[PDB]
Amino acid sequence: TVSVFSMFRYSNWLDKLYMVVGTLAAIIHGAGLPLMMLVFGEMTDIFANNLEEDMTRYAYYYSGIGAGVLVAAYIQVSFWCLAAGRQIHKIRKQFFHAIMRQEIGWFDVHDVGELNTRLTDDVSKINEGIGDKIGMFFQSMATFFTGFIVGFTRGWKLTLVILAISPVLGLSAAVWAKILSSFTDKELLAYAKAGAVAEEVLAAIRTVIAFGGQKKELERYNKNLEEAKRIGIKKAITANISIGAAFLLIYASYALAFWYGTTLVLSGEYSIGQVLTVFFSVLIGAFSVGQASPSIEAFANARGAAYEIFKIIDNKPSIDSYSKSGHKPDNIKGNLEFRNVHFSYPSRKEVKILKGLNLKVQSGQTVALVGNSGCGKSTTVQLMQRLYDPTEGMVSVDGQDIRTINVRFLREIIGVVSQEPVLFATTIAENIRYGRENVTMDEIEKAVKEANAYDFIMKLPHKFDTLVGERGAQLSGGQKQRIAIARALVRNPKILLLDEATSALDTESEAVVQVALDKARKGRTTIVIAHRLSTVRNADVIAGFDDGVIPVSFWRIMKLNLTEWPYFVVGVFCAIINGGLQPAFAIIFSKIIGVFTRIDDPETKRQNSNLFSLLFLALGIISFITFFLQGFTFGKAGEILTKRLRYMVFRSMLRQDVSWFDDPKNTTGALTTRLANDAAQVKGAIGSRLAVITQNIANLGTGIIISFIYGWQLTLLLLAIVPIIAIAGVVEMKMLSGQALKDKKELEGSGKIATEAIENFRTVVSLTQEQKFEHMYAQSLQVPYRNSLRKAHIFGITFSFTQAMMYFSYAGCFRFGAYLVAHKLMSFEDVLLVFSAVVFGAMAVGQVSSFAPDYAKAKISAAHIIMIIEKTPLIDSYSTEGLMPNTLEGNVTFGEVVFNYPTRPDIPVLQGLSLEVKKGQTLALVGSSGCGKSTVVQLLERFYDPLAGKVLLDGKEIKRLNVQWLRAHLGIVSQEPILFDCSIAENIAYGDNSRVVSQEEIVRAAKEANIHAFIESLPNKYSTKVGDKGTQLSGGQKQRIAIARALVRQPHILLLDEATSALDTESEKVVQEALDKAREGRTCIVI
């Protein structure tokens, strides 16, 4: 994604030398096995015909090659794994440095879970990418050319004979298909559109559920998925037909070459040993290409992850603390001011929070600005600390603007006591000493004495010993606030900004906290923000602030993808014949070898000439047909399965309750990933496991049977030796997984420190304690750094020993085989046949098992998919039962209603009020006890379920009525509307999905919403799109569109959720009068 020479950005001279020596050793190692074939052939030629002198000369040659490759095998892996270990340590340490530098305005746009997951996984992905794989790649190439070179030095004809008949071509086509699959994609765009629709619906799940438009969204998703299925089928057809056409062209060219010259073109005189060289070397070189595909896949994934890693690293923030270039004034008596400053959030530019606020505080003063819990409370607190730069105007301290002061020095003289006193999982002494790192115990003691908290600490055991406040005994709000006050006192600031110190903690402990605040407030400027106006009277200046105004894996997966049984039958038959064809190639070669290696026989006989071309054409046609049929059928079956599964899982997700979405385990990102990743790349693996198993069985069993027919002793010897190399590969993968799984345990302290810093990032930047967290992460990396550098020796030794065993296996086979052919028994053609069957079927199945994605994540993904279906039908949106009365009096009564949020049931939200509504009467909950305004909209719409209490609609309990009918007779308007990416006409007709409404109803609703003129003034009357790529609209236009959408339904009860959110105080009159005009003769409840 970025480049090919940019992933190696962090590499000094030593790492460059490591990589160069590693790749040179790999090149030497790769060109060793084909060269051994050459000397083996020389030795056999000499033997077939002083004997000890020739035998011992090549024996030292044979031992000399073996010794060098044994050393080269160690150097190839040892030096590459050291270079990757040194770069990843620098990348991992540098990436976390960049994260701690980005300001607050960037974190809210991104996701903390996404950032932690990326830091945990894509760095490991890069490590796997630039690790030992690259070296392996060169080895394969170092073999490949070498083998062919040998095959083309000792007679080019024979290679051309072996290149066609032998099993080379099918495996080559399989690996070309693997690479093309790894490089094309082209599904991504289609499912990108479909998943854009999916995430648009999922993010707006509240309004979709409240409006009952599940079927319409399901149909839109179905249409997009059908388009994706069509394009995927076309792509699979094109790819498979192209590869098959290449196969057919190769074999037809062979057949034509055999014409126009009756076999004299491809025949010559060859020795008994030369054929062994030009056969085994060519076969090994052609088979080596199968080992270079995982390397290419790994490198591509490494580039993909490194793109995002380097984008985050390279970005330069507008304001950064890691820049010691700024004014550092002394004697800051404190003269903060606001020179009529307008501020708007960078994310929501249209919404304005600070509408030109002016403030002026002298030294040794205090302010008591009073805010509202809904919003407009902590914006000035954030703006003062240079978290967000002002849009218009400026903020100055002591007559000096803060834009010319280094932010690191600026943030170290400001108190930041906030609503929730977040603490870290460490000792209380460390928590108090986080600010002002050069602090002795005496200062901490003095602060806790002037914090009204040491008495409580001493009454409890463990005097500042551990008292962890994250996983241990969770302290009460009062003592946590006292701890935060102590930390602020240790910081020793000059501008104290106590914010929401009386937000949610109980009134029982108000005395101690308030006394501590009053004691600590003396001697410094104070901009206290409070909601209750009964204890901030001690401040010099009091003003009001408001809107700028002052499981287990399961089988039975085959039940899914069952209706498409003819595709499976045809694919299985084609897999059987394709797998069985490859061993038959050995028989064909053993039968026709005698015709391509003799010129003494007159060309008049020419054998037959024509039937050889017929055989080549027949083999080409059969291979083409079988490969095309297998690929097309299995691809089509997999795509149909994934489309149907996506449809069903999306329907199941839509059906279930909103509380399932409210669970923090599954957010919109998790569900999008489930619909995207774990429904298409996994179930295809289970569907094609039948194909791969059938192909492997047909490849191996047929070869074993034909070898047994053509031999007994050598066949049994090879059937005994192949399990040895299989066990060697098992040991290799076991050693790889021994550290691939121990790495997670090793990298656990670093991960927890990183996630603690990232999750609480606002407190970290406020305290300017990023350097300490960076150092802790540095140590938690340093220990696993030594562990990873020690892993290199073990990995190198294991790889070297496995390679030595694989190298010694070939020598033993030739020693025994020559022991059989010399004493008659088996002809050399039979030896070639049995080798090509047994060992080159074992290698072939070993390579094919690497493809066809693993049956490990597919099972857990299938379990997740199955568990998502029929998961929580407790409150089904389209329940069939229930009564639907015709009359609707519109009376809502509440009695002793007690409800708790399922995510946090310990904290109550409903006190058990008694609220009764008559027809044609309006009321608001702002004047109630508070904190219970944004909940009644869930209760009346049956989003949740009251644990204790009762709700009556027109004197009837709402639990018995059908949910769909209840949702179809309620109008809801929120503070802001979310508009789907479609035309305005559909966004207006969305109000009533029971039946299709024509243009007349939409026009009348727009007229009643005072929005018709604006819509008609647009270049497109009703076909204009909205959202991201559409025509952007202001707050008033969106509010009017929402009012029109609500009024299309013609409901009987209206639910307003802070509609008058003070959107610039310019278009409020028109929307207010439209709402008042639409509120006549209808029950309403304003929040």
875 belongs to a structural domain: no
| Residue 223 among known ligand-binding residues | no
CA separation for the pair 375, 361 (Å, rounded): 23
Give ∠ CA 460-463-469 in degrees, rounded to 5: 70
| Residue 983 among known ligand-binding residues | no
Q: Do 32 and 68 touch, CB atoms closer than 8 A?
A: yes
Do residue 447 and residue 507 come from a single domain? yes
Do residue 702 and residue 847 come from a single domain? yes
Stretch (H or E) spanning 339: strand 337-344
CA-nearest of 1086, 1039, 1047 to 936 is 1086
Supply φ then ψ for residue 1052, to 5 degrees. Answer: -115, -20
Domain boundary among 491, 515, 544: 544
Do residue 569 and residue 668 come from a single domain? yes
Q: The sheet that has 541-544: what strands, in order across it?
A: 495-496, 525-527, 366-370, 541-544
887 belongs to a structural domain: no
- What DSSP state is assigned to residue 416? -
- What DSSP state is assigned to residue 315? P
CA separation for the pair 424, 430 (Å, rounded): 9
493 belongs to a structural domain: yes
Do residue 134 and residue 271 come from a single domain? yes
| Residue 157 among known ligand-binding residues | no
Stretch (H or E) spanning 544: strand 541-544
| Residue 982 among known ligand-binding residues | no
Q: The sheet that has 922-924: what strands, in order across it?
A: 922-924, 1083-1086, 1053-1056, 971-973
CATH of the domain at 42: 1.20.1560.10
Q: Do 909 and 935 touch, CB atoms closer than 8 A?
A: yes
| Residue 375 among known ligand-binding residues | yes
877 belongs to a structural domain: no
Do residue 503 and residue 568 come from a single domain? no
Stretch (H or E) spanning 897: strand 892-898
Residue 525, strand partner residues: 495
| Residue 929 among known ligand-binding residues | yes
Q: How many domains does the chain have?
A: 3
| 759 Cβ neighbours under 8 A, 6+ residues apart | 112, 116
Query: Resolution in angstroms for this experimental structure?
Result: 3.8
The span from the first CA to the last CA of the chain, in angstroms, equals: 49
Both structure tokens of 1068: 């409020």
| Residue 850 among known ligand-binding residues | no
CA-nearest of 379, 414, 370, 385 to 503 is 370
Range of 415's domain? 337-544
Domain boundary among 544, 578, 593: 544
111 belongs to a structural domain: yes
Do residue 828 and residue 960 come from a single domain? no
Residue 665, strand partner residues: none
Cα separations in angstroms, 359 against 362, 686, 936: 10, 67, 38
| 726 Cβ neighbours under 8 A, 6+ residues apart | 842, 846
CA separation for the pair 322, 1054 (Å, rounded): 53
Do residue 256 and residue 380 come from a single domain? no
Both structure tokens of 775: 């150092």
Cα separations in angstroms, 230 against 190, 218, 237, 528, 571: 10, 18, 11, 62, 20
Q: Do 1048 and 997 touch, CB atoms closer than 8 A?
A: yes
Q: Do 470 and 423 touch, CB atoms closer than 8 A?
A: yes
| Residue 166 among known ligand-binding residues | no
How was this structure determined? It was done by: cryo-EM
327 belongs to a structural domain: no
| Residue 912 among known ligand-binding residues | no
| Residue 68 among known ligand-binding residues | no
| Residue 613 among known ligand-binding residues | no
| Residue 934 among known ligand-binding residues | yes
Q: What is the dihedral of CA 575, 576, 579, 584, to 10 degrees?
A: -140
| Residue 620 among known ligand-binding residues | no
959 belongs to a structural domain: yes
Do residue 688 and residue 583 come from a single domain? yes
At which residue do the structure tokens 């050459």 appear? 38
CA separation for the pair 404, 477 (Å, rounded): 38
CA separation for the pair 300, 128 (Å, rounded): 11
Do residue 91 and residue 238 come from a single domain? yes
Q: Do 596 and 645 touch, CB atoms closer than 8 A?
A: no
| Residue 376 among known ligand-binding residues | yes
Do residue 720 and residue 674 come from a single domain? yes
Do residue 268 and residue 353 come from a single domain? no
Residue 526, strand partner residues: 366, 496
Give ∠ CA 923-926-931 in degrees, rounded to 5: 130
Q: Which amino acid is at 1015?
A: I
| Residue 1067 among known ligand-binding residues | no
Domain boundary among 805, 836, 868: 868
Q: Do 1025 and 1031 touch, CB atoms closer than 8 A?
A: yes
CA separation for the pair 717, 140 (Å, rounded): 28
Residue spans of alpha helices (H) in 656-667:
658-662
805 belongs to a structural domain: yes
Task: Report helix angle 610-655 to 168-184, nearest 10.
Answer: 30
Instruction: Encode 730-743 in three state secondary structure.
Output: HHHHHHHHHHHHHH
Do residue 617 and residue 766 come from a single domain? yes
At which residue do the structure tokens 């803060």 appear? 402
CA-nearest of 211, 215, 217, 218 to 941 is 211
DSSP 115-163: HHHHHHHHHHHHHHHSSSHHHHHHHHHHHHHHHHHHHHHS-HHHHHHHH
| Residue 393 among known ligand-binding residues | no
CATH of the domain at 363: 3.40.50.300
